[PDB]
Design a protein around this motif. Structure first.
Motif, mmCIF file in Angstrom:
data_model
loop_
_atom_site.group_PDB
_atom_site.id
_atom_site.type_symbol
_atom_site.label_atom_id
_atom_site.label_comp_id
_atom_site.label_asym_id
_atom_site.label_seq_id
_atom_site.Cartn_x
_atom_site.Cartn_y
_atom_site.Cartn_z
ATOM 1 N N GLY A 299 0.822 -1.210 0.000
ATOM 2 C CA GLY A 299 0.000 0.000 0.000
ATOM 3 C C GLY A 299 0.851 1.254 0.000
ATOM 4 N N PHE A 300 0.217 2.395 0.255
ATOM 5 C CA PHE A 300 0.879 3.698 0.199
ATOM 6 C C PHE A 300 1.391 4.129 1.570
ATOM 7 N N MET A 301 2.711 4.271 1.686
ATOM 8 C CA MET A 301 3.325 4.896 2.856
ATOM 9 C C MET A 301 3.662 6.331 2.458
ATOM 10 N N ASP B 287 -16.582 12.400 9.244
ATOM 11 C CA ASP B 287 -17.232 11.558 10.250
ATOM 12 C C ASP B 287 -17.120 10.060 9.974
ATOM 13 N N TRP B 288 -16.227 9.679 9.062
ATOM 14 C CA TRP B 288 -16.042 8.257 8.748
ATOM 15 C C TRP B 288 -15.624 7.465 9.985
ATOM 16 N N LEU B 289 -14.847 8.111 10.852
ATOM 17 C CA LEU B 289 -14.485 7.570 12.157
ATOM 18 C C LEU B 289 -14.737 8.641 13.231
ATOM 19 N N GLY C 13 -4.739 11.256 8.273
ATOM 20 C CA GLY C 13 -3.754 10.289 7.785
ATOM 21 C C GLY C 13 -4.082 9.655 6.438
ATOM 22 N N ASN C 14 -5.372 9.466 6.155
ATOM 23 C CA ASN C 14 -5.820 8.913 4.874
ATOM 24 C C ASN C 14 -6.664 9.904 4.058
ATOM 25 N N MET C 15 -6.380 11.198 4.235
ATOM 26 C CA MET C 15 -7.013 12.282 3.466
ATOM 27 C C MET C 15 -6.150 12.690 2.260
ATOM 28 N N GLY D 18 -3.613 14.889 0.056
ATOM 29 C CA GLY D 18 -2.435 15.666 0.430
ATOM 30 C C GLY D 18 -1.577 15.046 1.519
ATOM 31 N N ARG D 19 -1.821 13.770 1.827
ATOM 32 C CA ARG D 19 -1.184 13.113 2.968
ATOM 33 C C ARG D 19 0.328 12.903 2.829
ATOM 34 N N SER D 20 0.852 12.953 1.604
ATOM 35 C CA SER D 20 2.312 12.906 1.429
ATOM 36 C C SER D 20 3.002 14.259 1.644
ATOM 37 N N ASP E 12 -17.882 15.163 0.418
ATOM 38 C CA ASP E 12 -17.562 15.068 1.842
ATOM 39 C C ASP E 12 -16.088 14.727 2.097
ATOM 40 N N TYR E 13 -15.578 13.720 1.388
ATOM 41 C CA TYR E 13 -14.199 13.257 1.568
ATOM 42 C C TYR E 13 -13.134 14.318 1.238
ATOM 43 N N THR E 14 -13.418 15.186 0.271
ATOM 44 C CA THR E 14 -12.406 16.091 -0.274
ATOM 45 C C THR E 14 -12.578 17.575 0.082
ATOM 46 N N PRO F 120 -2.523 12.491 -3.591
ATOM 47 C CA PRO F 120 -1.421 11.817 -4.287
ATOM 48 C C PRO F 120 -1.688 11.279 -5.707
ATOM 49 N N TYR F 121 -2.916 11.382 -6.206
ATOM 50 C CA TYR F 121 -3.304 10.644 -7.421
ATOM 51 C C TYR F 121 -3.282 11.460 -8.709
ATOM 52 N N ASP F 122 -3.114 12.771 -8.573
ATOM 53 C CA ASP F 122 -3.305 13.691 -9.688
ATOM 54 C C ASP F 122 -2.312 13.513 -10.829
ATOM 55 N N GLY G 32 -7.652 -5.428 -1.332
ATOM 56 C CA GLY G 32 -7.750 -4.175 -2.079
ATOM 57 C C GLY G 32 -6.440 -3.902 -2.802
ATOM 58 N N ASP G 33 -6.534 -3.319 -3.999
ATOM 59 C CA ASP G 33 -5.366 -2.824 -4.778
ATOM 60 C C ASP G 33 -4.463 -3.883 -5.434
ATOM 61 N N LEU G 34 -4.207 -4.976 -4.713
ATOM 62 C CA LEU G 34 -3.354 -6.074 -5.195
ATOM 63 C C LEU G 34 -4.151 -7.328 -5.576
ATOM 64 N N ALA H 237 -23.828 -9.936 13.826
ATOM 65 C CA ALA H 237 -24.681 -8.747 13.773
ATOM 66 C C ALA H 237 -24.043 -7.507 14.403
ATOM 67 N N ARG H 238 -22.712 -7.460 14.447
ATOM 68 C CA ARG H 238 -22.007 -6.353 15.099
ATOM 69 C C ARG H 238 -22.560 -6.180 16.534
ATOM 70 N N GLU H 239 -22.913 -4.957 16.952
ATOM 71 C CA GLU H 239 -23.431 -4.733 18.318
ATOM 72 C C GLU H 239 -24.769 -5.451 18.589
ATOM 73 N N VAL I 41 -11.195 -4.996 12.050
ATOM 74 C CA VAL I 41 -11.217 -6.434 11.792
ATOM 75 C C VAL I 41 -12.645 -6.931 11.573
ATOM 76 N N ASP I 42 -13.366 -6.247 10.685
ATOM 77 C CA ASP I 42 -14.783 -6.511 10.462
ATOM 78 C C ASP I 42 -15.119 -6.899 9.009
ATOM 79 N N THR I 43 -14.139 -7.468 8.308
ATOM 80 C CA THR I 43 -14.328 -7.888 6.905
ATOM 81 C C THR I 43 -14.308 -9.407 6.685
ATOM 82 N N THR J 263 -7.407 -7.572 8.158
ATOM 83 C CA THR J 263 -7.332 -6.254 8.773
ATOM 84 C C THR J 263 -7.432 -5.202 7.676
ATOM 85 N N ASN J 264 -7.645 -3.958 8.082
ATOM 86 C CA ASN J 264 -7.775 -2.844 7.152
ATOM 87 C C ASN J 264 -6.546 -1.938 7.251
ATOM 88 N N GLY J 265 -5.409 -2.442 6.786
ATOM 89 C CA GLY J 265 -4.167 -1.663 6.824
ATOM 90 C C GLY J 265 -3.003 -2.361 7.493
HETATM 91 O O1 LIG Z 1 -15.884 1.191 1.749
HETATM 92 C C1 LIG Z 1 -16.748 0.081 1.784
HETATM 93 C C2 LIG Z 1 -17.578 0.071 3.066
HETATM 94 O O2 LIG Z 1 -16.879 0.625 4.167
HETATM 95 C C3 LIG Z 1 -17.497 0.352 5.420
HETATM 96 O O3 LIG Z 1 -16.862 1.026 6.524
HETATM 97 C C4 LIG Z 1 -15.662 0.438 6.996
HETATM 98 C C5 LIG Z 1 -14.534 1.452 6.948
HETATM 99 O O4 LIG Z 1 -14.983 2.714 7.491
HETATM 100 C C6 LIG Z 1 -14.122 3.797 7.214
HETATM 101 C C7 LIG Z 1 -14.385 4.338 5.812
HETATM 102 O O5 LIG Z 1 -13.623 3.556 4.908
HETATM 103 C C8 LIG Z 1 -13.624 4.039 3.589
HETATM 104 O O6 LIG Z 1 -12.853 3.182 2.736
HETATM 105 C C9 LIG Z 1 -11.465 3.306 2.972
HETATM 106 C C10 LIG Z 1 -10.917 1.897 3.230
HETATM 107 O O7 LIG Z 1 -11.397 1.416 4.468
HETATM 108 C C11 LIG Z 1 -9.381 1.841 3.188
HETATM 109 O O8 LIG Z 1 -8.952 0.492 3.157
HETATM 110 C C12 LIG Z 1 -8.798 2.618 1.999
HETATM 111 O O9 LIG Z 1 -7.394 2.759 2.235
HETATM 112 C C13 LIG Z 1 -6.560 2.787 1.092
HETATM 113 C C14 LIG Z 1 -5.692 4.048 1.230
HETATM 114 O O10 LIG Z 1 -6.448 5.218 0.961
HETATM 115 C C15 LIG Z 1 -4.441 4.020 0.350
HETATM 116 O O11 LIG Z 1 -3.614 5.105 0.706
HETATM 117 C C16 LIG Z 1 -3.701 2.694 0.563
HETATM 118 O O12 LIG Z 1 -2.560 2.620 -0.265
HETATM 119 O O13 LIG Z 1 -4.591 1.657 0.202
HETATM 120 C C17 LIG Z 1 -5.665 1.535 1.118
HETATM 121 C C18 LIG Z 1 -6.405 0.227 0.851
HETATM 122 O O14 LIG Z 1 -6.994 0.256 -0.430
HETATM 123 O O15 LIG Z 1 -9.395 3.901 1.887
HETATM 124 C C19 LIG Z 1 -10.803 3.904 1.729
HETATM 125 C C20 LIG Z 1 -11.257 5.340 1.463
HETATM 126 O O16 LIG Z 1 -10.956 5.665 0.115
HETATM 127 C C21 LIG Z 1 -10.891 7.088 -0.098
HETATM 128 O O17 LIG Z 1 -10.005 7.740 0.715
HETATM 129 C C22 LIG Z 1 -8.631 7.396 0.562
HETATM 130 C C23 LIG Z 1 -8.169 7.597 -0.883
HETATM 131 O O18 LIG Z 1 -6.916 6.968 -1.046
HETATM 132 C C24 LIG Z 1 -9.154 6.947 -1.848
HETATM 133 O O19 LIG Z 1 -8.853 7.283 -3.181
HETATM 134 C C25 LIG Z 1 -10.590 7.351 -1.555
HETATM 135 O O20 LIG Z 1 -11.375 6.529 -2.390
HETATM 136 C C26 LIG Z 1 -12.513 7.235 -2.919
HETATM 137 O O21 LIG Z 1 -13.430 7.644 -1.911
HETATM 138 C C27 LIG Z 1 -14.485 8.428 -2.428
HETATM 139 C C28 LIG Z 1 -15.273 9.053 -1.283
HETATM 140 O O22 LIG Z 1 -15.985 10.160 -1.796
HETATM 141 C C29 LIG Z 1 -15.359 7.558 -3.334
HETATM 142 O O23 LIG Z 1 -15.928 6.497 -2.591
HETATM 143 C C30 LIG Z 1 -14.519 6.975 -4.473
HETATM 144 O O24 LIG Z 1 -15.277 5.990 -5.146
HETATM 145 C C31 LIG Z 1 -13.218 6.346 -3.960
HETATM 146 O O25 LIG Z 1 -12.360 6.089 -5.054
HETATM 147 C C32 LIG Z 1 -15.052 4.099 3.039
HETATM 148 O O26 LIG Z 1 -15.063 4.747 1.786
HETATM 149 C C33 LIG Z 1 -16.029 4.815 3.974
HETATM 150 O O27 LIG Z 1 -17.340 4.574 3.489
HETATM 151 C C34 LIG Z 1 -15.874 4.343 5.424
HETATM 152 O O28 LIG Z 1 -16.568 5.184 6.329
HETATM 153 C C35 LIG Z 1 -17.967 4.854 6.462
HETATM 154 O O29 LIG Z 1 -18.729 5.526 5.476
HETATM 155 C C36 LIG Z 1 -20.125 5.279 5.480
HETATM 156 C C37 LIG Z 1 -20.744 6.018 4.292
HETATM 157 O O30 LIG Z 1 -20.243 5.394 3.129
HETATM 158 C C38 LIG Z 1 -20.641 6.031 1.899
HETATM 159 O O31 LIG Z 1 -20.040 7.235 1.649
HETATM 160 C C39 LIG Z 1 -18.633 7.214 1.442
HETATM 161 C C40 LIG Z 1 -18.308 6.332 0.243
HETATM 162 O O32 LIG Z 1 -16.913 6.233 0.056
HETATM 163 C C41 LIG Z 1 -18.913 4.947 0.461
HETATM 164 O O33 LIG Z 1 -18.704 4.130 -0.670
HETATM 165 C C42 LIG Z 1 -20.410 5.059 0.766
HETATM 166 O O34 LIG Z 1 -20.883 3.779 1.129
HETATM 167 C C43 LIG Z 1 -20.718 5.711 6.824
HETATM 168 O O35 LIG Z 1 -22.080 5.339 6.874
HETATM 169 C C44 LIG Z 1 -19.954 5.070 7.989
HETATM 170 O O36 LIG Z 1 -20.390 5.632 9.207
HETATM 171 C C45 LIG Z 1 -18.446 5.287 7.848
HETATM 172 O O37 LIG Z 1 -17.726 4.603 8.855
HETATM 173 O O38 LIG Z 1 -13.410 0.993 7.556
HETATM 174 C C46 LIG Z 1 -13.533 0.746 8.945
HETATM 175 C C47 LIG Z 1 -14.583 -0.350 9.125
HETATM 176 O O39 LIG Z 1 -14.798 -0.581 10.492
HETATM 177 C C48 LIG Z 1 -15.897 0.037 8.453
HETATM 178 O O40 LIG Z 1 -16.827 -1.028 8.531
HETATM 179 C C49 LIG Z 1 -18.964 0.807 5.456
HETATM 180 O O41 LIG Z 1 -19.630 0.125 6.498
HETATM 181 C C50 LIG Z 1 -19.739 0.606 4.146
HETATM 182 O O42 LIG Z 1 -20.845 1.480 4.117
HETATM 183 C C51 LIG Z 1 -18.883 0.840 2.906
HETATM 184 O O43 LIG Z 1 -18.614 2.217 2.757
#
Ligand SMILES: OC[C@H]1O[C@@H](O[C@H]2[C@@H](OC[C@H]3O[C@@H](O[C@H]4[C@H](O)[C@@H](O)[C@H](O[C@H]5[C@H](O)[C@@H](O)[C@H](O)O[C@@H]5CO)O[C@@H]4CO[C@H]4OC[C@@H](O)[C@H](O)[C@H]4O[C@@H]4O[C@H](CO)[C@H](O)[C@H](O)[C@H]4O)[C@H](O)[C@@H](O)[C@@H]3O[C@@H]3O[C@H](CO[C@H]4OC[C@@H](O)[C@H](O)[C@H]4O)[C@@H](O)[C@H](O)[C@H]3O)OC[C@@H](O)[C@@H]2O)[C@H](O)[C@@H](O)[C@H]1O
Ligand SMILES: OC[C@H]1O[C@@H](O[C@H]2[C@@H](OC[C@H]3O[C@@H](O[C@H]4[C@H](O)[C@@H](O)[C@H](O)O[C@@H]4CO)[C@H](O)[C@@H](O)[C@@H]3O[C@@H]3O[C@H](CO[C@H]4OC[C@@H](O)[C@H](O)[C@H]4O)[C@@H](O[C@@H]4O[C@H](CO[C@H]5OC[C@@H](O)[C@H](O)[C@H]5O)[C@@H](O)[C@H](O)[C@H]4O)[C@H](O)[C@H]3O)OC[C@@H](O)[C@@H]2O)[C@H](O)[C@@H](O)[C@H]1O
Ligand SMILES: [Ca+2]
Length: 728
Positions: free
Chosen positions: A18-20, A92-94, A121-123, A125-127, A181-183, A262-264, A447-449, A622-624, A698-700, A716-718
């Protein structure tokens, strides 16, 4: 709930994955290096093994956010000290507020102070960085650049307490994209650079430079130890300073780009040196900003500590044919790229890459020139020259860390020998896992690989499942025909069918002519016990079944978007689904589903899973809402009264003297968070992790090993794939 001792490790993917966004060398102790991950914590380099050691694994699932490492700072006065700015998202993702983590030993143990704002950390401009910095004369003092308009913050008690620097003029104006929201957040104050020569040891450093993400005015200076701040006169507009480095000759080198990354791509960048002695700004951009060949940010910046005229910068991103790594040995007057155009195709390389430590880096694909796999990289937001070895470079990519030990060979007309330097790093986000009863011990969907067959848990795989895919999102095998598997995926880059089948336990894959109706592929997959049907539930799509290996698909009746589907492990005709608060059974191989009318059910579920060797035994995670079981195909469920939270559920070889497969979950029992095992069908539970082995989200996926008692594999997620076994 009592604990039993386990040994925990990563299943090796190799090479990070992944991306450091950053690597940080200590300025005073040789071989002291740290690396920060976007979603995977932080690592310290071990020079004796040439491997990285993970530092933050104690964070349990409620503190997953703190694996998001915004910045890392290593103390030049006392190299035992290390600090981390932690927090993954500014939205509010976390829920967690940001925190500054502090250690004296050196990332072996931590304490933290929670801040009144979030880190990213995962927004975007993080580099850009490093945002966190320690005063090299008075190491009691730390500064922190923040996101979201919180500006510049400061500590004067070794990072224990923190306050805003109210006199700092500009918290930043640049926003990646207000429309989502994310950006939408202010990128903010991005780096702090101390001028060590401006004070004597023991005294607060008087001259401090600060970079800010603001196209109108980005570079600030204090000359009175941070009491007052002014913009530096003559500074360029309107790009964003990624990195700043003050060389021993007084030159402050700064890389600029038109976006935060970092993607531009396409793309403008500049590189400047500011003479801190004279006030003069000199443009040293490798490709003239006015040229249309200038088509990317300049991002990574390295300066050789032993020769301040030796500098390197990287592109972010050319994307094609590969990135640029420019080196100068005359302070930026002239530059050389690590490759040159020859006779198109055809490129002249001043480097080799050895990917023996992570052979998946070529994507199992020979490219058409001018492209070549493996690439130098992409997302190269940071590059470092070892301050104690001019021949050693390291740089980051979206998939690994690369480095060399013969850098100056380039200056004498030899090739730089690049190799993977990310051994010990495991940063993958793992989406699904299976441990079949025959074949390899583990097959992953990441993811990614994409994912891998894991023949040996301690040896990294050589190739990913399907190189044209981007993420493997679901995988299943036919319980009674375990060589047969189905993989579902996303494919961002290629028009390929996004389900694949394997007949050899996941070693080789083929795609069918047709897909279940879908927008982006992905989602989950369930394979019949006897391999006669497959149900694909694509992302934001209704479950669909195939009985002819994807030649044709039919929508499963009575289900819909969000349905959670699993197959019975004994009877190929039986499938199960949880959908809109109701439970459903199919007895015709997935074609039709019927509401079982179960009188007691959780409101929602994360996962459902049937048990190998037990027809009609289905468990709900069923989570909680807890953990539930049926033994009659889902017509009735019992909620287990001894489990609070269960995010995922899995099964492994039965314990001796017991008549059920061992059951493995992550979640919460008796106000203890972690991973748990039951050897007696849920009657009693033991905690199998501990306070030092949390590994975050650890919920996947979770699975036991049907052939090895006590072993558990957890997605795990990371932090990649972790596995545990009882201690010996
Ligand atoms: O994602 C599927 C699923 O997630 C479930 O929630 C999880 C999760 O909660 C946190 C948050 O995670 C986001 O996804 C992360 C992912 O977990 C990471 O593994 C990944 O890391 C990358 C990293 O960025 C790289 O640097 C590295 O090299 O690789 C790793 C691994 O691949 O990042 C993503 C986030 O991606 C975005 O940010 C980082 C950028 O690098 C990346 O380009 C960017 O991707 C874009 O994001 C935009 C957003 O506008 C768009 O989706 C583009 O399509 C995409 O390319 C989830 O995205 C986020 O949803 C999670 O937070 C939960 O969000 C819920 C609302 O979700 C909706 O809105 C956002 C949208 O992105 C979703 O698709 C949509 O469903 C909200 O209700 C909830 O309260 C939030 O927690 O990880 C922790 C775990 O416990 C959670 O269970 C979630 O339940 C489910 O709904 C679904 O989103
Ligand atoms: O992203 C797909 C999208 O691209 C649009 O074009 C824009 C986009 O381009 C990025 C891609 O550029 C290719 O090169 C192009 C070049 O840009 C053109 O100027 C030229 O004319 O043609 C060239 C050849 O086609 C690169 O070849 C692509 O690799 C690059 O896509 C990015 O790929 C990397 C992974 O690459 C590796 O793995 C796949 C393997 O095939 C490749 O060889 C390897 O190098 C991804 O990086 C990972 O990203 C994930 C996170 O991913 C999420 O967030 C970002 C989103 O983009 C993802 O969809 C989402 O899933 C991260 O966790 C990992 O750490 C990274 O390693 C990138 O995500 C890919 O984007 O962007 C720049 C812009 O200028 C282009 O116009 C195009 O319009 C669309 O049709 C579509 O293809
Ligand atoms: Ca760095």
């Amino acid at each position: 709930v009592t604990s039993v001792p386990y040994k925990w490790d990563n299943v090796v993917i190799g090479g990070g994955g992944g991306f450091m966004p950053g690597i940080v060398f200590n300025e005073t102790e040789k071989d002291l290096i740290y690396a920060r991950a976007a979603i995977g914590g932080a690592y310290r380099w071990d020079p004796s093994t040439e491997t990285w050691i993970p530092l933050l694994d104690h964070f349990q699932m409620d503190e997953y956010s703190y694996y998001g490492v915004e910045s890392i700072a290593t103390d030049p006065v006392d190299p035992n000290r290390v600090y981390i700015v932690a927090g993954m998202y500014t939205n509010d993702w976390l829920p967690n507020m940001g925190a500054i983590l502090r250690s004296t030993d050196r990332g072996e143990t931590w304490e933290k102070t929670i801040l009144p704002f979030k880190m990213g950390g995962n927004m975007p401009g993080r580099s850009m960085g490093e945002r966190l910095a320690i005063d090299p004369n008075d190491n009691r003092i730390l500064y922190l650049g923040t996101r979201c308009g919180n500006g510049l913050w400061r500590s004067t008690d070794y990072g224990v307490t923190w306050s805003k620097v109210e006199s700092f003029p500009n918290p930043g104006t640049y926003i990646y994209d207000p429309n989502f929201d994310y950006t939408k957040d202010i990128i903010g104050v991005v780096w702090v650079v101390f001028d060590k020569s401006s004070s004597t040891p023991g005294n607060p450093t008087k001259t401090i430079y600060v970079g800010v993400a603001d196209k109108n005015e980005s570079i600030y200076r204090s000359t009175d130890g941070g009491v007052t701040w002014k913009a530096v006169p003559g500074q360029p507009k309107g790009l964003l300073p990624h990195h700043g480095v003050l060389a021993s000759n007084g030159m402050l080198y700064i890389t600029y780009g038109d976006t935060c990354g970092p993607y531009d791509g396409n793309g403008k960048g500049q590189v400047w040196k500011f003479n801190t002695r004279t006030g003069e700004w000199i443009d040293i951009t490798p490709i003239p900003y006015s040229s249309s060949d200038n088509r990317f940010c300049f991002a990574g910046l390295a300066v050789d500590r032993q020769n301040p005229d030796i500098i390197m910068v990287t592109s972010m991103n050319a994307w094609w044919p590969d990135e640029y790594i420019f080196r100068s040995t005359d302070g930026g007057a002239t530059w050389k790229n690590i490759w040159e155009w020859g006779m198109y195709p055809e490129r002249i390389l001043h480097y080799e890459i050895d990917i023996s430590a992570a052979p998946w880096l070529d994507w199992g694909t020979e490219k058409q020139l001018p492209e070549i796999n493996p690439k130098l990289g992409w997302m190269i937001g940071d590059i470092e020259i070892d301050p104690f070895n001019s021949d050693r470079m390291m740089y980051v990519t979206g998939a690994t860390i690369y480095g060399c030990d013969n850098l100056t060979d380039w200056d004498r007309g030899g090739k730089v020998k690049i190799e993977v330097k990310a051994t010990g790093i495991e940063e993958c986000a793992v989406l699904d896992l299976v441990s079949p009863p025959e074949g390899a011990p583990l097959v992953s969907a990441v993811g990614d690989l994409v994912g891998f067959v894991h023949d040996d848990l301690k040896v990294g795989p050589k190739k990913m499942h399907v190189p044209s895919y981007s993420s493997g999102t679901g995988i299943d095998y036919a319980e009674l025909v375990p060589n047969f598997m189905a993989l579902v995926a996303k494919a961002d880059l290629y028009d390929v069918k996004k389900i694949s089948f394997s007949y050899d336990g996941g070693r080789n894959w083929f795609q069918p002519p047709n897909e279940a109706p879908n927008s982006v592929g992905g989602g989950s997959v369930a394979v019949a016990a006897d391999a006669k049907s497959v149900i694909w539930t694509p992302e934001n799509a209704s479950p669909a079944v195939t009985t002819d290996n994807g030649n044709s698909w039919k929508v499963c009746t009575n289900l819909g978007m969000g349905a959670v589907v699993a197959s019975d492990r004994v009877n190929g005709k039986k499938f199960y689904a949880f959908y809109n608060g109701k439970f459903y059974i199919s007895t015709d191989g997935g074609l039709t589903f019927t509401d079982t009318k179960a009188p007691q059910l959780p409101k929602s579920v994360n996962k459902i899973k049937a048990v190998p060797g037990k027809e009609g035994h289905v468990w709900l995670a069923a989570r909680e809402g807890g953990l539930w079981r049926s033994t009659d195909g889902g017509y009735t469920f019992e909620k287990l009264s001894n489990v609070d939270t269960a995010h995922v559920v899995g099964f492994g070889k039965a314990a001796p003297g017991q008549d059920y497969m061992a059951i493995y979950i992550t979640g919460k029992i008796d106000n203890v968070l972690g991973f748990f095992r039951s050897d007696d069908a849920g009657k009693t539970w033991v905690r199998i992790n501990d306070d030092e082995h949390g590994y975050g989200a650890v919920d996947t996926a979770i699975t036991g090993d049907p052939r090895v008692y006590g072993r558990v594999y957890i997605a795990t997620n990371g932090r990649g794939i972790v596995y545990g076994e009882p201690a010996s």
